Design a protein around this ligand. Structure first.
Ligand SMILES: COc1ccccc1C(=O)[C@@H]1CCC[C@H]1C(C(=O)O)C(=O)O
Ligand SMILES: COc1ccccc1C(=O)[C@@H]1CCC[C@H]1C(C(=O)O)C(=O)O
Lengths: 226, 227
Protein backbone atom coordinates (compact mmCIF):
# COMPACT_ATOMS: atom_id res chain seq x y z
CA UNK A 1 0.00 0.00 0.00
CA UNK A 2 0.74 3.72 -0.22
CA UNK A 3 -0.76 6.75 1.58
CA UNK A 4 -4.52 7.36 1.51
CA UNK A 5 -5.77 10.74 2.79
CA UNK A 6 -9.43 11.62 2.91
CA UNK A 7 -9.89 15.34 2.24
CA UNK A 8 -12.98 16.63 4.01
CA UNK A 9 -14.25 20.12 4.84
CA UNK A 10 -16.06 21.78 7.69
CA UNK A 11 -18.83 22.71 5.28
CA UNK A 12 -19.78 23.20 1.67
CA UNK A 13 -17.98 25.75 -0.47
CA UNK A 14 -14.85 25.85 1.72
CA UNK A 15 -12.51 25.03 -1.17
CA UNK A 16 -12.07 21.26 -0.80
CA UNK A 17 -11.41 20.84 -4.50
CA UNK A 18 -8.81 23.60 -4.90
CA UNK A 19 -7.11 22.16 -1.82
CA UNK A 20 -7.05 18.67 -3.38
CA UNK A 21 -5.54 20.23 -6.51
CA UNK A 22 -2.98 22.29 -4.59
CA UNK A 23 -1.86 19.30 -2.54
CA UNK A 24 -1.77 17.13 -5.65
CA UNK A 25 0.31 19.76 -7.47
CA UNK A 26 2.68 20.19 -4.51
CA UNK A 27 3.11 16.43 -4.13
CA UNK A 28 3.76 15.85 -7.84
CA UNK A 29 6.39 18.61 -7.83
CA UNK A 30 7.89 16.69 -4.90
CA UNK A 31 8.08 13.63 -7.18
CA UNK A 32 5.10 11.79 -5.67
CA UNK A 33 2.61 9.92 -7.84
CA UNK A 34 -0.92 11.16 -7.10
CA UNK A 35 -4.40 9.73 -7.66
CA UNK A 36 -7.63 11.52 -6.70
CA UNK A 37 -10.92 9.74 -6.02
CA UNK A 38 -14.21 11.68 -5.93
CA UNK A 39 -16.62 8.77 -5.41
CA UNK A 40 -19.75 10.94 -5.53
CA UNK A 41 -20.17 14.17 -7.48
CA UNK A 42 -23.32 16.26 -7.31
CA UNK A 43 -24.33 19.51 -8.99
CA UNK A 44 -23.49 18.36 -12.51
CA UNK A 45 -26.45 20.04 -14.24
CA UNK A 46 -24.73 23.38 -13.56
CA UNK A 47 -21.36 21.95 -14.59
CA UNK A 48 -19.65 20.87 -11.36
CA UNK A 49 -16.86 18.38 -12.02
CA UNK A 50 -14.23 18.42 -9.29
CA UNK A 51 -12.05 15.73 -10.86
CA UNK A 52 -11.78 17.78 -14.05
CA UNK A 53 -10.69 20.81 -12.01
CA UNK A 54 -8.04 18.72 -10.27
CA UNK A 55 -6.95 17.62 -13.74
CA UNK A 56 -6.68 21.11 -15.20
CA UNK A 57 -5.00 22.64 -12.14
CA UNK A 58 -2.60 19.85 -11.11
CA UNK A 59 -2.18 17.55 -14.14
CA UNK A 60 -3.37 14.43 -12.29
CA UNK A 61 -4.63 11.74 -14.66
CA UNK A 62 -5.63 8.97 -12.25
CA UNK A 63 -9.02 10.55 -11.56
CA UNK A 64 -11.60 8.01 -10.35
CA UNK A 65 -15.31 8.48 -9.65
CA UNK A 66 -18.39 6.33 -9.28
CA UNK A 67 -21.51 8.49 -9.53
CA UNK A 68 -22.70 11.88 -10.80
CA UNK A 69 -25.92 13.62 -9.82
CA UNK A 70 -27.35 16.70 -11.58
CA UNK A 71 -28.88 18.46 -8.57
CA UNK A 72 -26.61 20.78 -6.52
CA UNK A 73 -27.56 18.99 -3.30
CA UNK A 74 -26.18 16.54 -0.76
CA UNK A 75 -25.76 13.10 -2.41
CA UNK A 76 -28.58 11.39 -0.54
CA UNK A 77 -30.84 14.33 -1.44
CA UNK A 78 -29.64 14.43 -5.05
CA UNK A 79 -30.07 10.67 -5.32
CA UNK A 80 -33.63 10.82 -3.96
CA UNK A 81 -34.61 13.58 -6.38
CA UNK A 82 -33.10 11.54 -9.22
CA UNK A 83 -34.86 8.39 -8.02
CA UNK A 84 -31.66 6.34 -7.89
CA UNK A 85 -29.59 5.00 -5.02
CA UNK A 86 -26.08 5.98 -4.02
CA UNK A 87 -23.16 3.61 -4.67
CA UNK A 88 -22.49 0.72 -2.32
CA UNK A 89 -20.08 1.06 0.59
CA UNK A 90 -18.31 -1.90 -1.06
CA UNK A 91 -17.78 0.00 -4.32
CA UNK A 92 -16.22 3.02 -2.64
CA UNK A 93 -13.88 1.14 -0.32
CA UNK A 94 -12.70 -1.20 -3.08
CA UNK A 95 -12.20 1.54 -5.68
CA UNK A 96 -10.01 3.39 -3.17
CA UNK A 97 -8.11 0.24 -2.19
CA UNK A 98 -7.34 -0.49 -5.87
CA UNK A 99 -6.12 3.06 -6.47
CA UNK A 100 -3.66 2.76 -3.62
CA UNK A 101 -0.14 1.57 -4.40
CA UNK A 102 3.34 1.99 -2.90
CA UNK A 103 4.87 5.39 -3.59
CA UNK A 104 1.48 6.99 -4.39
CA UNK A 105 -0.54 9.62 -2.53
CA UNK A 106 -4.23 8.82 -3.02
CA UNK A 107 -6.59 11.64 -2.07
CA UNK A 108 -10.26 10.83 -1.44
CA UNK A 109 -12.45 13.92 -1.79
CA UNK A 110 -15.73 13.90 0.05
CA UNK A 111 -18.84 15.76 -0.92
CA UNK A 112 -19.55 18.58 1.53
CA UNK A 113 -18.69 17.78 5.13
CA UNK A 114 -17.60 14.75 7.08
CA UNK A 115 -21.00 13.31 8.01
CA UNK A 116 -22.81 13.59 4.66
CA UNK A 117 -24.11 10.21 3.50
CA UNK A 118 -21.92 8.93 0.68
CA UNK A 119 -23.10 5.31 0.31
CA UNK A 120 -26.11 3.21 1.30
CA UNK A 121 -27.17 2.89 4.08
CA UNK A 122 -25.99 6.05 5.77
CA UNK A 123 -22.27 5.42 5.34
CA UNK A 124 -20.14 8.57 5.49
CA UNK A 125 -16.63 9.60 4.55
CA UNK A 126 -15.77 8.96 8.19
CA UNK A 127 -16.81 5.32 7.80
CA UNK A 128 -14.73 5.08 4.62
CA UNK A 129 -11.64 6.54 6.30
CA UNK A 130 -11.89 3.85 8.98
CA UNK A 131 -12.27 1.07 6.38
CA UNK A 132 -9.20 2.17 4.40
CA UNK A 133 -7.16 3.36 7.44
CA UNK A 134 -6.87 6.86 5.99
CA UNK A 135 -6.07 9.98 7.94
CA UNK A 136 -8.25 13.04 7.33
CA UNK A 137 -7.17 16.46 6.05
CA UNK A 138 -9.74 19.10 7.02
CA UNK A 139 -10.38 22.12 4.78
CA UNK A 140 -11.60 25.12 6.80
CA UNK A 141 -12.43 28.77 6.35
CA UNK A 142 -10.82 31.69 8.13
CA UNK A 143 -14.27 33.21 8.56
CA UNK A 144 -16.41 33.83 11.62
CA UNK A 145 -17.64 30.49 12.98
CA UNK A 146 -14.75 28.36 11.71
CA UNK A 147 -13.41 27.46 15.18
CA UNK A 148 -16.65 25.75 16.27
CA UNK A 149 -17.04 23.86 12.97
CA UNK A 150 -13.39 22.78 13.10
CA UNK A 151 -13.60 21.63 16.71
CA UNK A 152 -16.82 19.71 15.92
CA UNK A 153 -15.22 18.00 12.93
CA UNK A 154 -12.11 17.08 14.95
CA UNK A 155 -14.25 15.60 17.72
CA UNK A 156 -16.17 13.55 15.17
CA UNK A 157 -12.89 12.28 13.65
CA UNK A 158 -11.44 11.33 17.05
CA UNK A 159 -14.70 9.62 18.09
CA UNK A 160 -13.97 6.89 15.50
CA UNK A 161 -10.15 7.06 15.87
CA UNK A 162 -9.53 8.73 12.51
CA UNK A 163 -6.27 10.64 12.74
CA UNK A 164 -6.29 14.30 11.66
CA UNK A 165 -3.55 15.17 9.16
CA UNK A 166 -4.00 18.91 9.70
CA UNK A 167 -6.01 21.86 8.46
CA UNK A 168 -5.90 23.86 5.25
CA UNK A 169 -7.56 27.26 4.99
CA UNK A 170 -9.14 26.95 1.54
CA UNK A 171 -9.22 30.68 0.89
CA UNK A 172 -7.05 33.29 2.58
CA UNK A 173 -8.45 36.78 1.96
CA UNK A 174 -6.56 39.91 1.04
CA UNK A 175 -6.20 41.90 3.09
CA UNK A 176 -6.89 39.34 5.87
CA UNK A 177 -9.05 41.31 8.24
CA UNK A 178 -9.29 41.17 12.01
CA UNK A 179 -11.40 38.03 12.22
CA UNK A 180 -9.34 36.07 9.68
CA UNK A 181 -6.05 36.93 11.37
CA UNK A 182 -7.47 35.95 14.75
CA UNK A 183 -8.90 32.68 13.43
CA UNK A 184 -5.66 31.62 11.76
CA UNK A 185 -3.80 31.89 15.07
CA UNK A 186 -6.56 30.08 16.98
CA UNK A 187 -6.85 27.30 14.37
CA UNK A 188 -3.12 26.68 14.77
CA UNK A 189 -3.68 26.12 18.50
CA UNK A 190 -6.13 23.30 17.68
CA UNK A 191 -4.20 21.55 14.89
CA UNK A 192 -1.38 21.94 12.39
CA UNK A 193 -2.29 24.47 9.68
CA UNK A 194 -0.68 22.99 6.56
CA UNK A 195 -1.48 25.89 4.22
CA UNK A 196 -3.61 28.94 3.59
CA UNK A 197 -4.45 29.28 -0.04
CA UNK A 198 -4.71 32.78 -1.51
CA UNK A 199 -8.23 33.78 -2.40
CA UNK A 200 -8.69 33.58 -6.17
CA UNK A 201 -6.22 30.70 -6.58
CA UNK A 202 -8.85 28.57 -8.36
CA UNK A 203 -8.75 31.00 -11.33
CA UNK A 204 -5.01 30.58 -11.99
CA UNK A 205 -3.64 28.86 -15.05
CA UNK A 206 -1.78 25.61 -14.49
CA UNK A 207 1.62 27.28 -14.39
CA UNK A 208 0.70 29.91 -11.83
CA UNK A 209 -1.31 27.39 -9.79
CA UNK A 210 1.67 25.05 -9.72
CA UNK A 211 3.97 27.77 -8.36
CA UNK A 212 1.35 28.86 -5.82
CA UNK A 213 0.93 25.28 -4.63
CA UNK A 214 4.66 24.65 -4.27
CA UNK A 215 5.00 27.70 -2.01
CA UNK A 216 1.74 26.98 -0.13
CA UNK A 217 2.78 23.78 1.66
CA UNK A 218 5.84 22.82 3.66
CA UNK A 219 8.01 20.80 1.28
CA UNK A 220 9.22 18.45 4.03
CA UNK A 221 5.71 17.66 5.25
CA UNK A 222 4.58 16.98 1.69
CA UNK A 223 7.59 14.74 1.06
CA UNK A 224 6.94 12.88 4.30
CA UNK A 225 3.38 11.89 3.33
CA UNK A 226 4.54 8.77 1.46
CA UNK B 1 -35.67 24.32 40.04
CA UNK B 2 -37.61 24.76 36.84
CA UNK B 3 -36.71 23.92 33.27
CA UNK B 4 -33.41 25.20 31.82
CA UNK B 5 -32.87 24.99 28.07
CA UNK B 6 -29.68 26.11 26.41
CA UNK B 7 -30.33 27.47 22.95
CA UNK B 8 -27.40 26.78 20.66
CA UNK B 9 -26.88 26.78 16.91
CA UNK B 10 -24.98 24.98 14.21
CA UNK B 11 -23.17 28.25 13.68
CA UNK B 12 -23.51 31.98 13.90
CA UNK B 13 -26.20 33.82 12.00
CA UNK B 14 -28.62 30.88 12.19
CA UNK B 15 -31.25 32.84 14.16
CA UNK B 16 -30.72 31.82 17.81
CA UNK B 17 -31.98 35.16 19.08
CA UNK B 18 -35.23 35.18 17.11
CA UNK B 19 -35.74 31.55 18.18
CA UNK B 20 -35.21 32.54 21.82
CA UNK B 21 -37.76 35.32 21.43
CA UNK B 22 -40.27 33.08 19.64
CA UNK B 23 -40.08 30.25 22.15
CA UNK B 24 -40.25 32.81 24.97
CA UNK B 25 -43.32 34.38 23.43
CA UNK B 26 -45.03 30.99 22.93
CA UNK B 27 -44.29 29.93 26.50
CA UNK B 28 -45.51 33.23 27.95
CA UNK B 29 -48.74 32.83 26.00
CA UNK B 30 -49.11 29.38 27.60
CA UNK B 31 -48.87 30.93 31.06
CA UNK B 32 -45.24 29.98 31.71
CA UNK B 33 -42.91 32.30 33.60
CA UNK B 34 -39.95 32.89 31.20
CA UNK B 35 -36.45 34.26 31.77
CA UNK B 36 -33.85 34.68 29.01
CA UNK B 37 -30.12 34.72 29.79
CA UNK B 38 -27.19 35.63 27.50
CA UNK B 39 -24.00 35.01 29.50
CA UNK B 40 -21.61 36.16 26.77
CA UNK B 41 -22.47 38.90 24.27
CA UNK B 42 -19.96 40.04 21.63
CA UNK B 43 -20.25 42.75 18.99
CA UNK B 44 -21.60 45.39 21.36
CA UNK B 45 -19.62 48.12 19.58
CA UNK B 46 -21.64 47.51 16.45
CA UNK B 47 -24.89 47.55 18.43
CA UNK B 48 -25.34 43.80 18.94
CA UNK B 49 -27.58 43.17 21.94
CA UNK B 50 -29.55 39.91 21.82
CA UNK B 51 -31.28 40.37 25.18
CA UNK B 52 -32.70 43.72 24.04
CA UNK B 53 -33.96 42.14 20.80
CA UNK B 54 -35.64 39.37 22.83
CA UNK B 55 -37.35 42.01 24.99
CA UNK B 56 -38.37 44.04 21.93
CA UNK B 57 -39.77 41.08 19.98
CA UNK B 58 -41.30 39.06 22.84
CA UNK B 59 -41.92 41.55 25.64
CA UNK B 60 -39.66 39.69 28.05
CA UNK B 61 -38.37 41.84 30.89
CA UNK B 62 -36.75 38.96 32.84
CA UNK B 63 -33.45 39.36 30.97
CA UNK B 64 -30.00 38.68 32.36
CA UNK B 65 -26.57 39.29 30.89
CA UNK B 66 -23.04 38.92 32.16
CA UNK B 67 -20.09 39.50 29.81
CA UNK B 68 -20.18 42.09 27.00
CA UNK B 69 -17.34 42.66 24.51
CA UNK B 70 -17.16 45.31 21.77
CA UNK B 71 -15.82 43.47 18.73
CA UNK B 72 -18.11 41.14 16.70
CA UNK B 73 -15.83 38.11 17.05
CA UNK B 74 -15.72 34.90 19.02
CA UNK B 75 -15.66 35.71 22.77
CA UNK B 76 -12.02 34.76 23.35
CA UNK B 77 -10.78 37.03 20.54
CA UNK B 78 -13.25 39.77 21.40
CA UNK B 79 -12.10 39.70 25.04
CA UNK B 80 -8.43 39.69 24.00
CA UNK B 81 -8.94 42.63 21.64
CA UNK B 82 -10.54 44.63 24.48
CA UNK B 83 -7.88 43.77 27.03
CA UNK B 84 -10.45 41.82 29.07
CA UNK B 85 -10.94 38.30 30.39
CA UNK B 86 -13.68 35.78 29.77
CA UNK B 87 -15.98 35.09 32.73
CA UNK B 88 -15.22 32.23 35.08
CA UNK B 89 -17.31 29.08 34.86
CA UNK B 90 -19.14 29.73 38.13
CA UNK B 91 -20.08 33.26 37.07
CA UNK B 92 -22.04 31.73 34.16
CA UNK B 93 -23.48 28.91 36.27
CA UNK B 94 -24.48 31.21 39.15
CA UNK B 95 -26.20 33.57 36.71
CA UNK B 96 -28.32 30.67 35.43
CA UNK B 97 -28.85 29.11 38.88
CA UNK B 98 -30.06 32.41 40.31
CA UNK B 99 -32.66 32.73 37.49
CA UNK B 100 -33.88 29.14 37.71
CA UNK B 101 -36.94 28.44 39.84
CA UNK B 102 -39.98 26.12 39.83
CA UNK B 103 -42.58 26.97 37.20
CA UNK B 104 -40.05 28.94 35.15
CA UNK B 105 -38.56 28.23 31.74
CA UNK B 106 -35.04 29.67 31.64
CA UNK B 107 -33.52 29.95 28.15
CA UNK B 108 -29.73 30.33 27.98
CA UNK B 109 -28.66 31.79 24.64
CA UNK B 110 -25.24 30.69 23.45
CA UNK B 111 -22.67 32.71 21.57
CA UNK B 112 -22.11 31.23 18.13
CA UNK B 113 -22.08 27.43 17.99
CA UNK B 114 -21.95 24.75 20.65
CA UNK B 115 -18.18 24.42 21.12
CA UNK B 116 -17.42 28.17 21.24
CA UNK B 117 -15.29 28.90 24.31
CA UNK B 118 -17.37 30.95 26.78
CA UNK B 119 -15.20 30.77 29.91
CA UNK B 120 -11.59 30.06 30.80
CA UNK B 121 -10.33 27.46 30.21
CA UNK B 122 -12.06 25.91 27.19
CA UNK B 123 -15.45 25.93 28.95
CA UNK B 124 -18.28 25.77 26.39
CA UNK B 125 -22.05 25.91 26.45
CA UNK B 126 -22.00 22.10 26.39
CA UNK B 127 -20.13 22.08 29.72
CA UNK B 128 -22.54 24.66 31.12
CA UNK B 129 -25.47 22.49 30.02
CA UNK B 130 -23.95 19.54 31.89
CA UNK B 131 -23.46 21.62 35.04
CA UNK B 132 -27.06 22.90 35.17
CA UNK B 133 -28.69 19.69 33.84
CA UNK B 134 -30.15 21.52 30.82
CA UNK B 135 -31.29 20.04 27.55
CA UNK B 136 -30.16 21.75 24.33
CA UNK B 137 -32.40 23.28 21.67
CA UNK B 138 -30.39 23.43 18.41
CA UNK B 139 -31.06 26.21 15.89
CA UNK B 140 -30.30 25.22 12.26
CA UNK B 141 -30.61 26.61 8.74
CA UNK B 142 -32.37 25.00 5.80
CA UNK B 143 -29.46 25.68 3.44
CA UNK B 144 -26.84 23.43 1.84
CA UNK B 145 -24.55 22.12 4.57
CA UNK B 146 -27.06 22.08 7.43
CA UNK B 147 -27.29 18.28 7.65
CA UNK B 148 -23.57 17.82 8.32
CA UNK B 149 -23.53 20.74 10.77
CA UNK B 150 -26.59 19.44 12.56
CA UNK B 151 -25.23 15.93 12.81
CA UNK B 152 -21.88 17.17 14.13
CA UNK B 153 -23.65 19.22 16.79
CA UNK B 154 -25.95 16.40 17.89
CA UNK B 155 -23.01 14.01 18.10
CA UNK B 156 -21.20 16.48 20.34
CA UNK B 157 -24.24 16.85 22.61
CA UNK B 158 -24.59 13.05 22.87
CA UNK B 159 -20.88 12.69 23.67
CA UNK B 160 -21.58 14.46 27.01
CA UNK B 161 -25.08 13.05 27.50
CA UNK B 162 -26.70 16.44 26.94
CA UNK B 163 -30.24 15.71 25.79
CA UNK B 164 -31.37 17.33 22.55
CA UNK B 165 -34.70 19.12 23.04
CA UNK B 166 -35.08 19.21 19.24
CA UNK B 167 -34.29 21.41 16.28
CA UNK B 168 -35.65 24.78 15.19
CA UNK B 169 -35.16 26.08 11.65
CA UNK B 170 -34.32 29.72 12.33
CA UNK B 171 -35.46 31.00 8.92
CA UNK B 172 -37.88 29.20 6.62
CA UNK B 173 -38.47 30.57 3.10
CA UNK B 174 -41.93 30.83 1.57
CA UNK B 175 -42.01 29.28 -0.86
CA UNK B 176 -39.35 26.69 0.02
CA UNK B 177 -37.11 25.73 -2.85
CA UNK B 178 -36.22 22.14 -3.69
CA UNK B 179 -33.09 22.24 -1.51
CA UNK B 180 -34.77 23.72 1.57
CA UNK B 181 -37.71 21.33 1.27
CA UNK B 182 -35.32 18.38 0.97
CA UNK B 183 -33.24 19.53 3.94
CA UNK B 184 -36.29 19.95 6.16
CA UNK B 185 -37.34 16.35 5.51
CA UNK B 186 -33.83 15.09 6.19
CA UNK B 187 -33.64 17.25 9.33
CA UNK B 188 -36.87 15.77 10.70
CA UNK B 189 -35.44 12.24 10.30
CA UNK B 190 -32.45 13.27 12.44
CA UNK B 191 -34.45 14.83 15.30
CA UNK B 192 -37.78 16.44 16.09
CA UNK B 193 -38.18 19.77 14.28
CA UNK B 194 -40.01 21.89 16.86
CA UNK B 195 -40.63 24.89 14.59
CA UNK B 196 -39.53 26.58 11.37
CA UNK B 197 -39.76 30.32 11.84
CA UNK B 198 -40.87 32.26 8.74
CA UNK B 199 -38.16 34.32 7.10
CA UNK B 200 -38.29 37.93 8.28
CA UNK B 201 -39.82 37.09 11.68
CA UNK B 202 -37.40 39.53 13.31
CA UNK B 203 -39.19 42.39 11.49
CA UNK B 204 -42.72 41.68 12.78
CA UNK B 205 -44.24 43.98 15.41
CA UNK B 206 -45.08 42.66 18.88
CA UNK B 207 -48.54 41.42 17.95
CA UNK B 208 -47.56 39.78 14.69
CA UNK B 209 -44.52 38.28 16.38
CA UNK B 210 -46.64 36.90 19.21
CA UNK B 211 -49.08 35.39 16.73
CA UNK B 212 -46.27 33.92 14.67
CA UNK B 213 -44.73 32.43 17.82
CA UNK B 214 -47.96 30.86 19.07
CA UNK B 215 -48.47 29.12 15.72
CA UNK B 216 -44.84 28.11 15.24
CA UNK B 217 -44.57 25.48 18.00
CA UNK B 218 -46.79 22.58 19.00
CA UNK B 219 -48.67 23.97 22.00
CA UNK B 220 -48.48 20.59 23.75
CA UNK B 221 -44.69 20.60 23.45
CA UNK B 222 -44.38 24.15 24.80
CA UNK B 223 -46.82 23.46 27.64
CA UNK B 224 -44.99 20.26 28.50
CA UNK B 225 -41.65 22.03 28.87
CA UNK B 226 -42.46 23.16 32.41
CA UNK B 227 -44.37 21.24 35.04
C1 LIG C 1 -22.72 16.60 -1.04
O1 LIG C 1 -22.04 17.55 -0.34
C2 LIG C 1 -22.87 18.63 -0.06
C3 LIG C 1 -23.46 18.71 1.21
C4 LIG C 1 -24.29 19.75 1.55
C5 LIG C 1 -24.53 20.71 0.58
C6 LIG C 1 -23.97 20.63 -0.69
C7 LIG C 1 -23.13 19.59 -1.04
C8 LIG C 1 -22.50 19.55 -2.49
O2 LIG C 1 -22.36 18.55 -3.07
C9 LIG C 1 -22.07 20.75 -3.25
C10 LIG C 1 -23.11 21.05 -4.06
C11 LIG C 1 -22.63 20.68 -5.53
C12 LIG C 1 -21.01 20.78 -5.42
C13 LIG C 1 -20.76 20.25 -4.23
C14 LIG C 1 -19.37 20.64 -3.67
C15 LIG C 1 -18.16 20.15 -4.50
O3 LIG C 1 -18.32 19.60 -5.63
O4 LIG C 1 -16.99 20.31 -4.02
C16 LIG C 1 -19.13 20.16 -2.24
O5 LIG C 1 -18.62 19.03 -2.04
O6 LIG C 1 -19.41 20.90 -1.25
C1 LIG D 1 -19.15 35.08 20.02
O1 LIG D 1 -19.56 33.87 19.50
C2 LIG D 1 -19.30 33.78 18.14
C3 LIG D 1 -18.32 32.88 17.74
C4 LIG D 1 -18.01 32.72 16.41
C5 LIG D 1 -18.70 33.49 15.49
C6 LIG D 1 -19.67 34.42 15.89
C7 LIG D 1 -19.98 34.58 17.22
C8 LIG D 1 -21.08 35.61 17.64
O2 LIG D 1 -21.50 35.60 18.72
C9 LIG D 1 -21.64 36.66 16.73
C10 LIG D 1 -20.75 37.67 16.54
C11 LIG D 1 -21.48 39.02 17.00
C12 LIG D 1 -23.04 38.58 17.25
C13 LIG D 1 -22.95 37.31 17.63
C14 LIG D 1 -24.25 36.49 17.48
C15 LIG D 1 -25.41 37.04 18.31
O3 LIG D 1 -25.24 37.96 19.16
O4 LIG D 1 -26.55 36.51 18.16
C16 LIG D 1 -24.13 35.02 17.91
O5 LIG D 1 -24.24 34.72 19.13
O6 LIG D 1 -23.95 34.10 17.07
Amino acid sequence: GGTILVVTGTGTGVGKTVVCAALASAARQAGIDVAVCKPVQTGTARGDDDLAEVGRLAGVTQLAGLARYPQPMAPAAAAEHAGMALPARDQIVRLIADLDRPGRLTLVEGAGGLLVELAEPGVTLRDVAVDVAAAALVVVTADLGTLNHTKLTLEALAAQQVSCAGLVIGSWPDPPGLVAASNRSALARIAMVRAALPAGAASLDAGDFAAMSAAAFDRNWVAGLV
